[PDB]
Design an enzyme around this catalytic site. Structure first.
Site: not given
Ligand SMILES: Cc1cc2nc3c(=O)[nH]c(=O)nc-3n(C[C@@H](O)[C@@H](O)[C@@H](O)COP(=O)(O)OP(=O)(O)OC[C@H]3O[C@@H](n4cnc5c(N)ncnc54)[C@H](O)[C@@H]3O)c2cc1C
Ligand SMILES: Cc1cc2nc3c(=O)[nH]c(=O)nc-3n(C[C@@H](O)[C@@H](O)[C@@H](O)COP(=O)(O)OP(=O)(O)OC[C@H]3O[C@@H](n4cnc5c(N)ncnc54)[C@H](O)[C@@H]3O)c2cc1C
Lengths: 482, 482
Positions: A43, A196, A215, A281, A456
């Site tokens: 559609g 749209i 609008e 639109a 995180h």
């Molecule tokens: C540019 C644009 C972007 C959109 N983007 C999104 C989006 O990101 N997310 C979203 O959720 N929706 C968005 N929409 C909404 C739209 O995609 C949907 O709401 C619509 O597809 C829902 O499905 P529908 O089933 O009811 O009908 P339709 O899309 O409208 O399909 C009806 C179909 O049946 C056929 N038909 C119609 N009458 C007859 C007939 N008498 N005999 C035989 N076949 C027939 C037509 O050929 C058509 O293919 C967008 C719409 C537009 C216009």
């Molecule tokens: C490169 C790298 C990337 C990571 N990326 C992510 C990620 O995306 N997501 C994620 O969930 N985790 C990831 N980790 C995990 C890590 O960030 C966490 O698990 C860690 O920060 C958890 O917090 P923490 O509290 O227990 O201790 P910590 O990060 O280790 O902090 C302990 C702190 O207390 C201080 N400290 C230590 N001993 C003493 C002391 N005796 N006296 C005083 N201060 C002290 C230190 O200075 C330090 O600042 C990553 C780790 C690394 C090494």
């Protein structure tokens, strides 16, 4: 003897609604048929909507981020833009998909009948066979088939709303035209501030057009929370010359040197404007009034929808209606769900569309995502709520990704303390409201979400942090209620 | 009279554990102090871990995507790389953050004491004051303060595991060095196939190094599901010369023309290899044995952890331990949660770390994200499960974003049918496992998740689609169990 065929279920429309209903029913052991007037299933959504718009929006987003990375000492010049290849890349995701649906119908033994379907009588579809290969450009063969059904799932969708006064001209496009990528206009009017067009607008601005948007309402993305739009409008304000809101498009007169359009309103150029193109639109109309529903006894609203009940049933008991034809919000995900409930009723299971919440998502930059109760909805129902907002400005990941301007907002039922709404402005917003969406479906509370250990550093964890802020327990932000 | 100070709670360490415990307790009206030996709070995670690694990984990811967009006719030349500015961009997210923590302690009236803390007796910390301004480069002032506490939350984290035979040389770095961005090595060995190094590796390969990786185990990202790694290894295999797995690093001998390292194993060059640099990412050791815990009566494992109970309490009742020092998985999100339970016990609330699931995430490209039960865990416990996998190859959005090689996998308790595990390979994986994570926390079932209307087209909705596949109801994929 000529053209008659008998089926359990006949789904009129092969859109998201229809082919889901069709494959479901099919899945139930039912003998089903899809009557689609074009040759590709999926559609509007697959073919001139959801997918090409989003494939386009994703290329645009990557070219805006390279603009940003310079400042991190990652340096690129403007990109060379090939629209023949851009164009074809979109056409490629789409056909890949449409090709698979097809294959899926074959495998499910579903019959696709290419033809416009019209109701004969409550158990007969008159199909005027059709020919063509391009979605939206199919032509009637003159030949006609009579299809009979136990059940019928009407899924005929909606269509672009045409404004009466807008004249015809290759330069006035709707979104199927815009999705054509015939060329980047130097200047593009966008009539309507809804998702749209703002989505269309974003790809064009990033490809080079300067946009104006008109609008009639008080704002953009009508229906989302203004706090969210605010964040979106702040970050894209520079893509427009004029964000003409609360303004009327009065004249639209094409000239040799582009389309000249006059607006009525405030902060509206009193001088008629010139654009190399105008994107209308303005909305979408459901097609209930165009299927001779009256011949099946099916009742259609004057607006064109087929009101239906929690079972997808229309006033005619063996006739169900799903998707955009049934009602707002017109969204493909809505339609797939209604799609499964009507297929199940058809198989005699008793099914209710029982989901309480449906997600809306502007896939703009940033994405504006929301669900359930919104402040305005609440303010309308005068429901009493508790919103917990978590600023991305506090998020290590958003700061690192350079999106700390966005935030996660969780809204709660002030009596029960249950989550009932969620809004997310920021990249992947739509990939993240699904948890505020299961949350709402499970009737979770702030303690529910908050004690959930989200990973995180991520954008995802602001759902959790918004919850602790609800709990007054967030230690990543200044103390709450000292 | 000299240097003595009295507090309710004294948190030893200002890491993710510690400053969360500290601000929480503080939040309870308790008089608290953070003893941090460096001047910036945030610990390893903010300063030489989570955040700089991920800021870096996000720039790298955007430069790999521009490589892809060509094919969509979006064309850019290689980027000009400024590492002085890259370097400083990372330092910028980080200090922005560290600056705020600081400010947050001030506002919360928490005292940061800069000094190495060592236990005097069960109610006394001897703080050997310290001076410096750069995380990891702080030096003891010779001056010393005696701090007394009702309660003490030990949060001293872990530290890079040093391999005994590896000699010293500016070219053998751990991840704080790698995060230094002193220069892109032409060739970089990576000892250890775990997340940290593969994350380090990815930024370097994309900035230009050719990598080799050595893993004593049977694979990479040990602990994730191999099906997920498989997807990751397929897509980055081209970044390495040699993925030496099940291999021993035996010799590591620095030479004038780079570090020469000999490996023992299979598919291991019998000829000692030369690298312009070697990243030792062999693991992390907890620091329980380095705080004179024995003087508070606190018991420490020979491995160095402080086993503690669901209340974060150690054998010494008024002394709690949190974060990496307590046990695996060493992750900042784990630590913030334990962090809040111990602060609450300190305020006399009875709190249990009660969360049943903690997310792991390789923020590589694609991101590998998982939670709860994994097939191997299950296979180990011989728990009986039901996995539902949804291929992104079927996802309109992944196809459009060019990531259809990834998938969403939901695993269920085969008896109860409850979700107990989740794995996501693909961009934003970590922004999306938080819903399989609330799911698991709410004890949801496939019908729970599946009937949740997730928005389309998105990556997020494969959680839902994986659920329908569980339900045998997915109409976006070939029929299930005909
Ligand atoms: C540019 C644009 C972007 C959109 N983007 C999104 C989006 O990101 N997310 C979203 O959720 N929706 C968005 N929409 C909404 C739209 O995609 C949907 O709401 C619509 O597809 C829902 O499905 P529908 O089933 O009811 O009908 P339709 O899309 O409208 O399909 C009806 C179909 O049946 C056929 N038909 C119609 N009458 C007859 C007939 N008498 N005999 C035989 N076949 C027939 C037509 O050929 C058509 O293919 C967008 C719409 C537009 C216009
Ligand atoms: C490169 C790298 C990337 C990571 N990326 C992510 C990620 O995306 N997501 C994620 O969930 N985790 C990831 N980790 C995990 C890590 O960030 C966490 O698990 C860690 O920060 C958890 O917090 P923490 O509290 O227990 O201790 P910590 O990060 O280790 O902090 C302990 C702190 O207390 C201080 N400290 C230590 N001993 C003493 C002391 N005796 N006296 C005083 N201060 C002290 C230190 O200075 C330090 O600042 C990553 C780790 C690394 C090494």
């Amino acid at each position: 003897g000529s053209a008659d065929a008998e089926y359990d279920v006949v789904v009129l429309g092969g859109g998201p609604g229809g082919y889901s209903a069709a494959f479901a029913a099919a899945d139930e052991g039912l003998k089903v048929a899809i009557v689609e007037r074009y040759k590709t299933l999926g559609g509007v959504c697959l073919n001139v909507g959801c997918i090409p718009s989003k494939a386009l929006l994703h290329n645009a987003a990557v070219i805006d981020e390279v603009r940003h990375l310079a400042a991190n000492g990652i340096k690129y010049p403007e990109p060379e833009l090939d629209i023949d290849m851009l164009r074809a890349y979109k056409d490629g995701v789409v056909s890949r998909l449409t090709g698979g649906l097809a294959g899926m119908a074959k495998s499910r033994k579903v019959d696709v009948i290419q033809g416009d379907g019209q109701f004969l009588d409550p158990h007969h579809l008159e199909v005027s066979l059709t020919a063509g290969d391009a979605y939206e450009q199919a032509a009637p063969t003159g030949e006609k088939k009579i299809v009979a059904f136990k059940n019928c799932i009407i899924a005929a969708g909606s269509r672009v709303t045409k404004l009466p006064f807008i004249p015809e001209d290759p330069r006035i496009i709707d979104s199927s035209g815009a999705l054509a990528l015939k060329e980047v206009p130097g200047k593009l009017l966008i009539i309507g501030g809804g998702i749209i067009g703002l989505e269309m607008g974003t790809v064009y601005s990033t490809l080079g057009s300067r946009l104006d948007v008109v609008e009639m309402m008080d704002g953009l993305m009508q229906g989302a929370d203004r706090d969210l739009v605010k964040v979106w409008q702040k970050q894209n304000e520079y893509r427009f010359d004029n964000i003409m809101v609360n303004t009327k498009t009065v004249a639209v007169e094409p000239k040799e040197d582009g389309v000249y359009v006059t607006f009525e309103g405030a902060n509206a150029p009193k001088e008629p404007q010139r654009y190399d193109a105008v994107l209308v639109a303005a909305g979408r109309a459901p097609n209930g009034k165009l299927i001779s529903a009256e011949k099946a006894g099916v009742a259609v609203t004057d607006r064109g929808f087929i009101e239906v009940d929690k079972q997808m049933r229309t006033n005619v008991p063996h006739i169900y209606a799903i998707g955009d034809i049934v009602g707002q919000p017109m969204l493909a995900h809505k339609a797939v769900h209604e799609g499964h409930v009507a297929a199940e009723n058809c198989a005699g299971h008793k099914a209710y569309f029982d989901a309480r919440v449906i997600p809306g998502v502007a896939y703009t930059s940033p994405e504006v995502a929301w669900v359930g109760e919104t402040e305005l909805s609440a303010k309308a129902s005068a429901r009493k709520i508790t919103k917990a907002n978590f600023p991305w400005a506090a998020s290590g990941r958003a700061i690192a990704n350079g999106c700390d301007k966005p935030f996660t907002k969780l809204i709660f039922d002030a009596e029960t303390g249950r989550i009932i709404g969620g809004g997310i402005v920021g990249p992947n917003g739509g990939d993240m409201i699904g948890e505020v969406c299961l949350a709402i479906e499970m009737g979770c509370d702030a303690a529910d979400i908050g004690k959930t250990i989200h990973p995180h550093p991520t954008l995802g964890e602001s759902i959790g942090m918004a919850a602790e802020v609800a709990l007054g327990t967030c230690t990543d932000l200044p103390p709450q209620k000292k």
